[PDB]
Design a protein around this nucleic acid. Structure first.
Ligand SMILES: [Mg+2]
Ligand SMILES: [Mg+2]
Ligand SMILES: [Mg+2]
Ligand SMILES: [Mg+2]
Ligand SMILES: [Mg+2]
Ligand SMILES: [Mg+2]
Ligand SMILES: [Mg+2]
Ligand SMILES: [Mg+2]
Ligand SMILES: [Mg+2]
Ligand SMILES: [Mg+2]
Ligand SMILES: [Mg+2]
Ligand SMILES: [Mg+2]
Ligand SMILES: [Mg+2]
Ligand SMILES: [Mg+2]
Ligand SMILES: [Mg+2]
Ligand SMILES: [Mg+2]
Ligand SMILES: [Mg+2]
Ligand SMILES: [Mg+2]
Ligand SMILES: [Mg+2]
Ligand SMILES: [Mg+2]
Ligand SMILES: [Mg+2]
Ligand SMILES: [Mg+2]
Ligand SMILES: [Mg+2]
Ligand SMILES: [Mg+2]
Ligand SMILES: [Mg+2]
Ligand SMILES: [Mg+2]
Ligand SMILES: [Mg+2]
Ligand SMILES: [Mg+2]
Ligand SMILES: [Mg+2]
Ligand SMILES: [Mg+2]
Ligand SMILES: [Mg+2]
Ligand SMILES: [Mg+2]
Ligand SMILES: [Mg+2]
Ligand SMILES: [Mg+2]
Ligand SMILES: [Mg+2]
Lengths: 54, 116, 42, 113, 98
RNA sequence: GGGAUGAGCUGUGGGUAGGGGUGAAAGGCCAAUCAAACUCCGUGAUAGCUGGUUCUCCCCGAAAUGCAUUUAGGUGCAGC
RNA sequence: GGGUGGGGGAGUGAGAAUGCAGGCAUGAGUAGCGACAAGGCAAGUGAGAACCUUGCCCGCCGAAAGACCAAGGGUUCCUGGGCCAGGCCAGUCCGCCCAGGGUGAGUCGGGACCUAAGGCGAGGCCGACAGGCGUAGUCGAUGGACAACGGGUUGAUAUUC
């Protein structure tokens, strides 16, 4: 099966705009006084110092 | 414990068996291990059962542990420090902490450690 | 699964070399024609 | 309208579509929020984009002397750069082409209360 | 027209291996690629007024390098390794102490 | 799955060249192409056949019939 | 570098030839990422590590997936650097890039020794020309003859030092 004809700009764009990244929600944490923002699932690691904030 | 539902780690079930044994050995040797999150979740009950054998701490239990672990030094420390340390605690000997995923494949990672 | 080109330097020389070409007038004309065209190798 | 600073990253070796996927996450946000959104974004293109945004903020603070705490990512987009062509051999002697696309990433930050 | 032995010996080889051999009293030279062992032995004996035990030769092909679009080949060299007689006066390379 | 001490398998070197070779014979093979290889030249081969042939406006405006034809999807003369 | 006018000359006008060359879309962030031996942890290096280095486990080959040659390739070998191209991912690594270094024989494999099939071939015979064949001879190993073993050493050669 091969495409019968090339898609139109609108038809291509409607599908192409659905390929996007989901944004992760971030919470606030303070380590050694400095305050950072981390994803909530890493809150325990951030508190215990296993997170390298760079 | 409860068998894996779905495909076994590292390819086949024999490889999964080897993987669990090696991870348990490393965990008892170092007290703390960093690995992939599915592997840590699979390891937890497997390791706690061995710690229970060590808490019982008889010759029969030692043979049972040796049925799985091949590192005799790790077996010795498991029966001489780990079991006595956890004598007074009933279950829940380990702990899983989720950490940042690694590059290359974005695999979610975690650390698993003995409680103390 | 054997391909057509099996290299052999001595056979290549003895089948397509300078001394082979110079032996006949056809080969001499081939050499002269490549000289005329300006090829680096004859 | 607002005081602003510009930064550009030309010939970055990431496909423009892949760069757009992460740029759309931070367009319009403040610099501080955009930086950590890109920090925790798992996509690989989050690195170069974060570098450009940080460089633009640095330009504003150094050359323009603007307060970093009021900087907002106002404009950001990714154009196509030059494309290099390679060849991937396929079955039965066919040879297919491969494109190594690059991007030009432009960021404008402006300071506003 | 008149032949000089110094036309055969071109220059000494300077490298870690050559410096190692210098302690053993063995000298490495670059020679004209057409020469042979006996001619080299005669020439060294004449030049340095020394006694030569034996001569070892080796041909080395030149390296291929590419410059902008094509490959060019460096020149091929011949090295002669000369070991003096057991108790001969050393050859003073005049700057190669090892 | 067949042969596997034989009309065996195989390495190295050599020989047979295109209306020619070679063939325990299939028109098989002769450098991934063989009812006559490949390359260059004659050469811008030929094709009653297929396709294409690029700016504008004004005036007029058909034929698909007759005869002949190695002729019928071509063409000559007539007709328009 | 152009405009206008009187003349002169054209490679003078493209949308279609499954036309030619270059650039760029659609399919689409899709298929695929090349055998069914299998990887793990600790430590290190680093801006960056699933892939690099070290250690310890686990697994696979073992008439090979080990060790030597010949043919073929040609510096791919060693050391020190490198990391925008290449490696079907990343790479601090590399059979990739850069510079320098490295191959030592009276006895090993060949020539300087010998000939087979076959090649060339003084004269020669034959053939309008072109040329065909061939004697003397001379080449041509896959064969005949012919003298070395053990150990050590370099980052890289060794029956060669
Ligand atoms: Mg289907
Ligand atoms: Mg089941
Ligand atoms: Mg089994
Ligand atoms: Mg192929
Ligand atoms: Mg002269
Ligand atoms: Mg010697
Ligand atoms: Mg030699
Ligand atoms: Mg190079
Ligand atoms: Mg039978
Ligand atoms: Mg049989
Ligand atoms: Mg032959
Ligand atoms: Mg023919
Ligand atoms: Mg038939
Ligand atoms: Mg064929
Ligand atoms: Mg014919
Ligand atoms: Mg003609
Ligand atoms: Mg009318
Ligand atoms: Mg004009
Ligand atoms: Mg004029
Ligand atoms: Mg034209
Ligand atoms: Mg056009
Ligand atoms: Mg067209
Ligand atoms: Mg699809
Ligand atoms: Mg897939
Ligand atoms: Mg693979
Ligand atoms: Mg690590
Ligand atoms: Mg190497
Ligand atoms: Mg790289
Ligand atoms: Mg890569
Ligand atoms: Mg003859
Ligand atoms: Mg004659
Ligand atoms: Mg003969
Ligand atoms: Mg001979
Ligand atoms: Mg031989
Ligand atoms: Mg070696």
């Amino acid at each position: 099966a091969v495409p019968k004809r090339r898609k139109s700009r609108s038809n291509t764009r409607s599908r192409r705009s659905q390929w996007k990244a989901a944004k992760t929600e971030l919470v606030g944490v303070t380590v050694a006084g400095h305050a950072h923002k981390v994803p909530r699932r890493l809150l325990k690691a951030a508190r215990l110092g296993l997170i390298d904030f760079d | 414990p409860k068998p894996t539902k779905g495909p076994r780690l590292g390819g086949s079930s024999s490889h999964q068996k080897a993987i669990l044994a090696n991870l348990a050995t490393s965990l008892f040797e170092h007290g703390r291990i960093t690995t992939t999150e599915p592997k840590a979740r699979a390891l937890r009950p497997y390791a706690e059962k061995l710690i229970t054998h060590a808490k019982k701490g008889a010759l029969h239990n030692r043979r049972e542990v040796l049925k799985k672990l091949r590192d005799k030094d790790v077996v010795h420390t498991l029966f001489a420090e780990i079991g006595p340390f956890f004598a007074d605690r009933d279950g829940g000997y380990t702990r899983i902490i989720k950490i940042e995923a690694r590059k290359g494949d974005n695999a979610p990672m975690a650390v698993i450690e003995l409680v103390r | 699964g054997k391909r057509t080109f099996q290299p052999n330097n001595r056979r290549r020389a003895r089948v397509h070399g300078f001394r082979l070409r110079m032996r006949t007038r056809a080969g001499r004309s081939i050499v002269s024609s490549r000289r005329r065209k300006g090829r680096r190798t004859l | 309208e607002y005081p602003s600073a510009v930064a550009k990253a030309r010939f970055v070796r990431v496909s423009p579509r892949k760069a757009r996927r992460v740029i759309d996450l931070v367009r319009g946000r403040s610099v501080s929020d955009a930086l950590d959104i890109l920090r925790w974004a798992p996509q690989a293109a989050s690195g170069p984009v974060a570098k450009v945004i940080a460089s633009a903020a640095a330009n504003a603070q150094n050359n323009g002397g603007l307060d970093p705490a009021t900087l907002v990512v106002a404009t950001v987009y990714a154009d196509q750069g030059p494309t290099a062509k390679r060849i991937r051999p396929r079955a039965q002697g066919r040879a297919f082409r491969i494109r190594r696309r690059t991007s030009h990433i432009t960021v404008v930050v402006e300071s506003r209360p | 027209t008149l032949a000089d032995p110094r036309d055969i010996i071109l220059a000494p080889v300077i490298s870690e291996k050559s410096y190692g051999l210098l302690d053993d009293n063995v000298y490495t030279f670059l020679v004209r690629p057409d020469s042979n062992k006996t001619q080299i032995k005669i020439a060294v004996e004449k030049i340095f007024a020394v006694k030569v035990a034996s001569v070892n030769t080796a041909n080395r092909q030149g390296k291929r390098k590419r410059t902008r679009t094509g490959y060019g080949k460096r020149k091929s060299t011949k090295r002669a390794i000369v070991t003096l007689a057991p108790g001969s006066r050393p050859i003073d390379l005049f700057g190669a102490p090892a």
